[PDB]
Amino acid sequence: TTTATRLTGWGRTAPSVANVLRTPDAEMIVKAVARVAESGRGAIARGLGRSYGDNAQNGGGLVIDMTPLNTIHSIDADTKLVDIDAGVNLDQLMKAALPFGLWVPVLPGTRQVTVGGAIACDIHGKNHHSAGSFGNHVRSMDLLTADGEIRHLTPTGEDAELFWATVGGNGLTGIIMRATIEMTPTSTAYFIADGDVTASLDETIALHSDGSEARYTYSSAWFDAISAPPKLGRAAVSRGRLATVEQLPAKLRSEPLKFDANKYTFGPIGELWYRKSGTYRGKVQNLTQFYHPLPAGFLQYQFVIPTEAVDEFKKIIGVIQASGHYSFLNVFKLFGPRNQAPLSFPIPGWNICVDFPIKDGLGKFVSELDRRVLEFGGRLYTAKDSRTTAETFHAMYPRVDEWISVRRKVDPLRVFASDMARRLELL
């Protein structure tokens, strides 16, 4: 039934060997949990393995691969509801949903993530400030718990506490077998985008707190983290909203829902070029153009700093560029309101993802960053993390004790466990 397998997160680091059950048979899954529950080092569900960290592996224990469980059960355009197996991925879901005029309500940077993964990490996207994160759009889920019973959870009424502990719970309340998502109605597969380019960090912040952000449903930015000030924190901002059919050019209006370095570069002329090409209004783009503006030895690092703490945010960015650690691929966004999940990552404030080449001193440098992020009231994302301490984590997520208490009810015997749970002491 199982197979000894060497697993790593997307970051290809911190490997552990587990026994991996891969089956499309939901009853065999129920029975494997029932088995582990009788006996140990517990079990954890795994999706497409896109989380960079250690949350979907379980050294010396059981790992259940959920991807073969990928049935879309129904889609209903009138209710906007979608009933799907947890192994369904968001790209699969997106293609199936389109002909109904339905848009996946939250999309992350890659569509190769399972619904179970999207819920357990409570994922966010370019529309977080207008739409929240993934958990906000789940109307029901079926959770396989430690007792081998399947519980039907909904965001309100009874069992809401377990529901909201599961969202962002990193698989640690049990296995999401199935869920109902409420989709976003759309009449097209396209975006209308405005683009803006700023010349400094001070400007980037300025553009994000002037009010204009309320005019867009989607917003994010490419961020210079390498240049010394003033150029530090300059950005290319891409903001927009889903087009309606009347906004499409003629050629595209018959099929509105279908998805299908020189010598000048670092000089004044390319400064003008980049500025010009990054500044546009009412441009219609497909998903790949708008949302997908696109390995081994890198360290992903993502944090959010509370909105008010803006001077502290500027401080952290300053620390980053003068560190001698250079990140070229940086994504910035202002998050909106948070949800009620205790371990949910997003909070209203300044969010950034960076990507550091693995190098001498980087490990000790990120620990120091951790300290700064913590002190500044912010947190890091478990999906992007493999090396922070339990002490740092628990301070970053003050409702962790609230969460752990919920987990102890539903898993007294510690049937569900992962590398991350042990490292972060969520066990």
Ligand X SMILES: Cc1cc2nc3c(=O)[nH]c(=O)nc-3n(C[C@H](O)[C@H](O)[C@H](O)COP(=O)(O)OP(=O)(O)OC[C@H]3O[C@@H](n4cnc5c(N)ncnc54)[C@H](O)[C@@H]3O)c2cc1C
The residue sitting closest to ligand X, measured at its beta carbon, is 47
Of 210, 191, 138, nearest to 167 by C-alpha is 138
Give me 408's structure tokens.
């102890």
Asked whether position 46 contacts ligand X by CB under 6 A, the answer is yes
Q: Annotated binding residue at 49? A: yes
Of 186, 184, 188, nearest to 255 by C-alpha is 188
Of 370, 363, 364, 366, nearest to 393 by C-alpha is 370
Which of 10, 103, 190, 376 is close enough to bind ligand X by CB under 6 A?
Answer: 10
- CB nearer to ligand X: give 56 or 193: 56
Q: Annotated binding residue at 148? A: no
Asked whether position 204 contacts ligand X by CB under 6 A, the answer is no
- CB nearer to ligand X: give 107 or 205: 107
Cα→Cα distances 142→47, 150, 152, Å: 16, 6, 5
Asked whether position 11 contacts ligand X by CB under 6 A, the answer is no
Stretch that binds ligand X, among 108-116, 145-153, 155-163, 252-260 (CB under 6 A): 108-116
Q: Annotated binding residue at 39? A: no
Tokens 């204009």 -> residue:
212
| DSSP string of 205-274, one letter each residue | HHHHSSSGGGG-SEEEEEE--SSPTTSTT-EEEEEEEEPPGGGS-GGGTTSTT-----SSTTSHHHHHHH
Q: How far is the CB of 46 from ligand X (least distance, A)?
A: 4
Q: Annotated binding residue at 46? A: yes
Asked whether position 342 contacts ligand X by CB under 6 A, the answer is no
Q: Annotated binding residue at 140? A: no
Q: Identify the DSSP state of 384.
A: G
The answer to whether residues 235 and 330 touch, using CB atoms and an 8 Å cutoff, is no
Q: Annotated binding residue at 171? A: no
Q: How many Å apart are CA 392 and CA 425, to the nearest integer?
A: 11
- CB nearer to ligand X: give 178 or 314: 178
Q: How far is the CB of 108 from ligand X (least distance, A)?
A: 3
Q: How far is the CB of 22 from ligand X (least distance, A)?
A: 13
Asked whether position 66 contacts ligand X by CB under 6 A, the answer is yes
- CB nearer to ligand X: give 314 or 393: 393
Q: How far is the CB of 48 from ligand X (least distance, A)?
A: 4
Q: Annotated binding residue at 195? A: no
- CB nearer to ligand X: give 144 or 232: 144
Which of 170, 204, 238, 351 is close enough to bind ligand X by CB under 6 A?
Answer: 170
Which of 114, 145, 198, 386 is close enough to bind ligand X by CB under 6 A?
Answer: 114
Omega cis (within 30) before 230:
yes
Which of 21, 26, 29, 44 is close enough to bind ligand X by CB under 6 A?
Answer: 44
Which of 42, 47, 132, 342 is close enough to bind ligand X by CB under 6 A?
Answer: 47
Q: How far is the CB of 199 from ligand X (least distance, A)?
A: 26
Asked whether position 110 contacts ligand X by CB under 6 A, the answer is yes
Contacts of 417 (CB under 8 A, 6+ apart): 41, 42, 43, 44, 58, 61, 172, 427
Q: Identify the DSSP state of 168.
A: T
Asked whether position 109 contacts ligand X by CB under 6 A, the answer is yes
**Strand ranges of the sheet holding 150-153, from the earlier edge strand across to the other edge:** 72-75, 81-85, 175-182, 138-144, 150-153
Q: How far is the CB of 220 from ligand X (least distance, A)?
A: 9
Number of residues that bind ligand X (CB under 6 A): 31
CA 320, distance to chain mean position in Å, is 22
Contacts of 140 (CB under 8 A, 6+ apart): 152, 153, 154, 179, 180
Which of 42, 49, 256, 342 is close enough to bind ligand X by CB under 6 A?
Answer: 49
Quick one: angle between helices 362-375 and 310-321, nearest 10? 170
Q: Identify the DSSP state of 278.
A: T
115-144: contacts with ligand X (CB under 6 A):
116-118, 120-121, 123-125
The answer to whether residues 82 and 100 touch, using CB atoms and an 8 Å cutoff, is no
Asked whether position 192 contacts ligand X by CB under 6 A, the answer is no
Contacts with ligand X by CB under 6 A lie at 10, 44-51, 55-56, 66, 86, 108-110, 113-114, 116-118, 120-121, 123-125, 170-171, 175-176, 383
**Residues flagged as binding site for FAD:** 45-55, 109, 114-117, 121-124, 176, 381
